[PDB]
Amino acid sequence: SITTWEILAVSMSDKKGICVADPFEVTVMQDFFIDLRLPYSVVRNEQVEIRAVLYNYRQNQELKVRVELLHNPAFCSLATTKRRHQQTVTIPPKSSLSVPYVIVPLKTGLQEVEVKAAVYHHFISDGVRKSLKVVPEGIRMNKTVAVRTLDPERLGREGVQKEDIPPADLSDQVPDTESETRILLQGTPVAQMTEDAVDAERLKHLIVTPSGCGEENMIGMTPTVIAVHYLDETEQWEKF
Amino acid sequence: SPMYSIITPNILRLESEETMVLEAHDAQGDVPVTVTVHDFPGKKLVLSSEKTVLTPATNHMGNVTFTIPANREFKKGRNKFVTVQATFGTQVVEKVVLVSLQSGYLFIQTDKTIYTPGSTVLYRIFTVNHKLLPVGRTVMVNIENPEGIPVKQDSLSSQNQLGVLPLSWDIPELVNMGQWKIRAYYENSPQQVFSTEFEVKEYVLPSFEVIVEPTEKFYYIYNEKGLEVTITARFLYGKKVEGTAFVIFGIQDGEQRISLPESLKRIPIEDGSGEVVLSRKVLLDGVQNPRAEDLVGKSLYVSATVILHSGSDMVQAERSGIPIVTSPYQIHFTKTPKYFKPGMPFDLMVFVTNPDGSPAYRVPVAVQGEDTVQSLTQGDGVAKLSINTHPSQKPLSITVRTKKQELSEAEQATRTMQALPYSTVGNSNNYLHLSVLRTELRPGETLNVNFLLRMDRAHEAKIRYYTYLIMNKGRLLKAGRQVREPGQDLVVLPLSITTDFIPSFRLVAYYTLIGASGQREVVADSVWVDVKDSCVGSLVVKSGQSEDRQPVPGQQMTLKIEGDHGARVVLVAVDKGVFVLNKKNKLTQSKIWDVVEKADIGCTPGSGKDYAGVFSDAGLTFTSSSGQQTAQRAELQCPQ
Amino acid sequence: YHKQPWQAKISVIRPSKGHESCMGAVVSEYFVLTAAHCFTVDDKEHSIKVSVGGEKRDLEIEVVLFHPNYNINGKKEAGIPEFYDYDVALIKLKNKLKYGQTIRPICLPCTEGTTRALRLPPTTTCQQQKEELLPAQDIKALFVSEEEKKLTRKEVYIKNGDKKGSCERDAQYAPGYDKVKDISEVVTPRFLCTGGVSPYADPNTCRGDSGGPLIVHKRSRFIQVGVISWGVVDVCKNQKRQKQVPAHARDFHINLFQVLPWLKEKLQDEDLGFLAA
Amino acid sequence: SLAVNLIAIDSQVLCGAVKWLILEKQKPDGVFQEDAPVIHQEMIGGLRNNNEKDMALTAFVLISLQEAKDICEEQVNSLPGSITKAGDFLEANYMNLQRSYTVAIAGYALAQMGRLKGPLLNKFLTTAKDKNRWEDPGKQLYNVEATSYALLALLQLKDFDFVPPVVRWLNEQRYYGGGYGSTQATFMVFQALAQYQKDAPDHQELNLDVSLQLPSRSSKITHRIHWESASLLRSEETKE
Amino acid sequence: PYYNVSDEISFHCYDGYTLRGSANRTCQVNGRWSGQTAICDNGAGYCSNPGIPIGTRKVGSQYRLEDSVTYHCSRGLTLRGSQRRTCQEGGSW
């Protein structure tokens, strides 16, 4: 790739610790090169146009280039197994030229496009071999077969539950195309119960100073002991 | 009568070592101390038990460090506490402290910021404690779709892996586009969950980048000149771009965008650059509000689009968040303490910034009160002021403005705060201030900590030493004494700043004596100081080649790596074209310290309403045998 | 229907009742690999009967060879009642077995016979086979279980990938291991962890299945790589299957690649052709 | 024995009173008898009216011993023996009780031993009217206190399927203790609700063994969904 | 651009990937590479990564069940074996 690679480093010392380094850029360029740009995906049987731009960053030197598009049974261009669809152009100094290419994806899947180019009276050449997806003619649909609910004992029997699922329609399915069925399971709380605790603001009277004889002392000590105990578990010393 | 004190962080952490400062005032001879930590509620012994002896040779200071489990008994809602008990021979001093189940920090690194349906997401997890060090722990990792529903869950262990968990996740061809998420957390802390997002979308790497930088990082309302925006566009390999640009403006209300169709221009991009100006006329024509003072507070966004002359590529850029303020500056007392000392000097930590949020360099500031008293803002965007205070108990109100020349008073910024008096035990008017020369501290230098005392000579001779403690990343870095002979109103502490203080550190100093009538008084003071945030050690990656020229596609190059010894370095090369569509969620050292700093057990920048407040606001729990203990802390995070 | 010739059923009669019910695997014309905890020093040869091929009669054994490093009671000091480290043992029969459509050996790791089974070159080292049979991923294996006097296969997954630690640490829920300091001490490298809920709900091993062969079905061949040792949660009580099994109900086995030196020595005269390495 | 987690309790005193009840005031039957009834007959709660003094008192003293068992296990050596004696007694007469109060206080005493099974366990549950309260015709002190002992018994038996109705009845009655003769009610109603806040679940048993088999596949696809691994998208694709 | 005789090449997987086969391969006189095919699998698919034999080009990253992958040789080379492999039930292509 002709661009700037941004390398990132991360150290992990058992002594010092963690520390991420500063981004170190690395520019990678070439005097003469081809910039082949293809779409993310192209529809099958549809005639499109890819653009191959040839850059010439030579300060002051025009180039006589002869770019060519290699043949591929997966596509239908003006280049066959015996003919070579190629042009001969002259790219001015410090400039670029776009070379149009009309093709027709004949088969689906991830295909391959390659273009080469050489200059006259010089030892310079370059080529690009990238790939592009070929989406089958039609539209992306997602028929929801069914949305059943799983919960034995309620809609089951003897502890088990049977749930049949009829095959998808796919009546208007595009000829010669594949398709998958995504079965999906998932739990769901169900997280309930747990009751609320008595507000500590309602217990601002259980703080009685223990007093009396051998029996009255305990009677006055009880409301205080159990009160603090309940507040320690409910952690309601905040509102209290 | 003797006095056995104890100081521990407001919140104790699990699977770590918390320092425990023991003291005695005064007593004589050797005094054995048996520290025992139980759970809560209930005295279910025992978590951790330590022992030590206070010898007068060490001025009666203890230094015990316990490690709290971990433990599976600590499992939803509410909080968990531990009963920290310390016996000093016979007199028992106990105090319950809040517990943070947190085990440490987790940082997730993804190779790219955006992925295409079909590729694999390479991501690693770093398991470090509260001290940012490699540690073997068990981590739960989940990957939620754009609909926030986990599609993959694991449970790795960084044990014997040097705190680095290499992972990957294959993206199916048929996948839901959107903002995916990678969540992770320690098995012992299901509440503390870290997250890192990555976008999944069908895209193609452009050939060049488009940058949009306005002449100013803001916009003045009465500025007739308007908003000038620069359009810089160059290829990913440095070369400049030749094409045409399509720029359009718009006003952004509260989570709302009102496009301005009238502000559409078509500027030619020659020599890899362009220039567009938004007339003030169109800006006002956009909104249906005659008054221009109504736009104050809103923002503007630029939407440019560069297209080559070959029509082979087309990049779309955007610069949103352009503050339309009346003052090119802002003032924040967030770094300034909210408590003062009656009579003693009050220092201010003015924090001047720009409309965008970036620190301001050299900005004259002063207080409405006294003139001449000014201080040019430093590099970090912090000024140093110091006004005087009256012995009165009347709330202090300060109004700091900006005396920036080349700018009218009507275009300046102002902010007013309020400080509360420092309550004294028995109104003995015994205070303590800690003035520190505000300078950008750097690891390896030295700092001068001042100890200003205020009290009558009726008991000033009893003050023979201070007690300073260093708070760092929620722990006790160092604790010592500061000698003082009767007559010294100001002493200096030769503090050596190392690489540990990073990022910031707090300093709490207190003194004890017998004033009034056999009454034990405690007076303290805290101060927050920031240090130059940088790597603990060092790590640089430069080119190994002898400069020369630029590499060629398919060439070998030496990659020099200057890192720490015994350290494991993980690399990752990414095309800059990737950051063109998304440059968010990028792992940076700045973000690392950002998480650590926003986790301190302290809240108040310094000082408190009283002695027991200074410790709690700094991150310490002082508890003696005389009866002076700090406030209880229940909530994990800071108030508000 | 009997698609498990290697499968063997072991029974040990003891006073009062006993009837220790374990299982083994025919590995040669005399030896039958099986667990070691199914037997004890007290148990003689006349009290141990082994039946293979579904034969009604019981074969008389000669001697039970335990692993030199087997010590189930060598951890009581640390408070660990059970210790199934190196839980393997061979059973040399008194009579030679005539292989038929009901009796047939099973491939053992690091053998010239297994090399051909994996269709690998003769120059394949022992280390290469371990990478083929036991990769660093979620291996797909299976074991033989007995339900209603009828043998049945149970497809499971060996947690040898990144889910290895998750499956091992669940050994803490096991009876007696509830107070173990370091879980890595009760789970030696000589263990292969299986069962669980991820990636799938793997069937658990019973008490009668103990000593059962851990087989990896590849290339239409059956390769034994482990031996059923012990389980975390007992899900079989001679009544019905638990059905409500915990998410930590794991099953541990004994990696044969770790006990090779012992197997190669005891089976030197069986023409199994063990690799050097 | 409850304030041991709040203040400092001398083991000589706590265990001292326990040893006295065992050696002195306990017949070979394991029954505890009262010789000097307290002057305040209102602090004893549901023991004032004695239709079944033997079963009630023996259960009351028994519970107190089991709450101090973990403490006086070092000093008192005849404690385990005494606990068993009283247990054998209550279990032999639990099927003959008439008052809902005695059934609750004795049920919780047997629950701590796990000796509340079969017919005994069945009686304890059926006694509660409307399955939420162990009430007896007369007074309020005898009602709230009884239900409290029963609640602690349910939590002890880990039967959180019958607990919600009970706990709900207490909270929906609003009794913040305090007053005349509220010594028992207060100490129990808050002891049960506090113990409930610790033993309170969060959801219901989530363990689905969903196994789906496809015609174009030999083996089945078995998946288990637990509370921890809930809300998980377990998908399975099939091109057919 | 081309590998002469007795030329050696090494393979190395990324972090989180296991390397099966021969890491170091040398060009022999028979115009072939020594050792087995180098494959970098993470072990996340129902079937192991089919890998990409030297000189071929695999099309298909998904290694689920019933999934398939196609291969294509360079210009001037004859593809030997299968051009399409489907992940059959039982972990095997």
Ligand SMILES: *[C@@H]1O[C@H](CO)[C@@H](O)[C@H](O)[C@H]1NC(C)=O
């Ligand atoms: C079906 O797929 C399409 C494409 O992403 C989407 O628009 C639609 O919401 C999907 N429907 C369901 C049921 O999720």
